[PDB]
């Protein structure tokens, strides 16, 4: 089977693990250890083709740059997650983007900008407009998700796999 290697990136508390666990297990998990990284593998039917998705849920604990870069080098596509409720997490996406580009050396690396916590509109700190503008600058798609309500959860994983399939 095709194996699509997805890496979740983004600053702390944005929803990397909640998104991964909603996709994997159909549960909203609210207390997942912030420092725990893990890999997940699932067979999924992508546009009618059985494939395997592998998701590396990074937890930010790899501080040694060569090792972090090694993890990114193995990835084929990236979900770059921020929380719509934390402007600083949106700002931080630029750093993950630069890290990925240094390693992959390809501006067209499969990559979605993911604004999570869309069910907290009343706490929004990052406008849809500014996130769409950043996505346009980077030539990536912007999708807003909620790990709580499941909104666009399958979409971000499937659309990222579609980019991996098309581009690699
Ligand atoms: N309301 C809401 N809370 C979320 C969402 N995603 C994550 N959370 C909460 O935000 C906290 C951090 O999520 P987590 O996935 O552990 O963040 P990570 O550090 O990026 O892995 C947890 O308490 C989650 O329940 C979401 O879409 N909506
Ligand atoms: S490795 O398999 O021993 C390993 C070590 C650390 C992690 S992490 O906590 O998810 N940290 C990161 C992983 C990949 C890229 N950046 C990270 O933190 C900045 C995972 C696997
Ligand atoms: Ca996590």
From Swiss-Prot:
It is found in: Cell membrane; Cleavage furrow; Midbody, Midbody ring; Mitochondrion. Its EC number is 3.6.5.2. One of its GO terms (cellular component) is Schaffer collateral - CA1 synapse. GO terms for molecular function: ATPase binding; Edg-2 lysophosphatidic acid receptor binding; G protein activity; GDP binding; GTP binding; GTPase activity; myosin binding; ubiquitin protein ligase binding. A motif (Effector region) lies at residues 32-40. Changing residue 38 to N: No effect on cytokinesis. Impaired cytokinesis, as shown by increased number of binucleate cells. It is a lipid-anchor. Changing residue 38 to E: No effect on cytokinesis. Glycans are attached at residue 35. Alternates between an inactive form bound to GDP and an active form bound to GTP. Activated by a guanine nucleotide-exchange factor (GEF) and inactivated by a GTPase-activating protein (GAP). It catalyses: GTP + H2O = GDP + phosphate + H(+). Its main location: membrane. It is linked to Hiatt-Neu-Cooper neurodevelopmental syndrome: An autosomal dominant neurodevelopmental disorder characterized by global developmental delay, delayed walking or inability to walk, impaired intellectual development, poor or absent speech, axial hypotonia, and facial dysmorphism. Additional variable features may include seizures, autistic or behavioral abnormalities, and brain abnormalities. Interacts (via effector domain) with RALBP1; during mitosis, recruits RALBP1 to the mitochondrion where it promotes DNM1L phosphorylation and mitochondrial fission. Interacts with EXOC2/Sec5 and EXOC8/Exo84; binding to EXOC2 and EXOC8 is mutually exclusive. Interacts with Clostridium exoenzyme C3. Interacts with RALGPS1. Interacts with LPAR1 and LPAR2. Interacts with GRK2 in response to LPAR1 activation. RALA and GRK2 binding to LPAR1 is mutually exclusive. Interacts with CDC42. This is Ras-related protein Ral-A. It comes from Homo sapiens (Human). The gene is RALA. The chain holds residues 12 to 178 of 206 of the full protein.
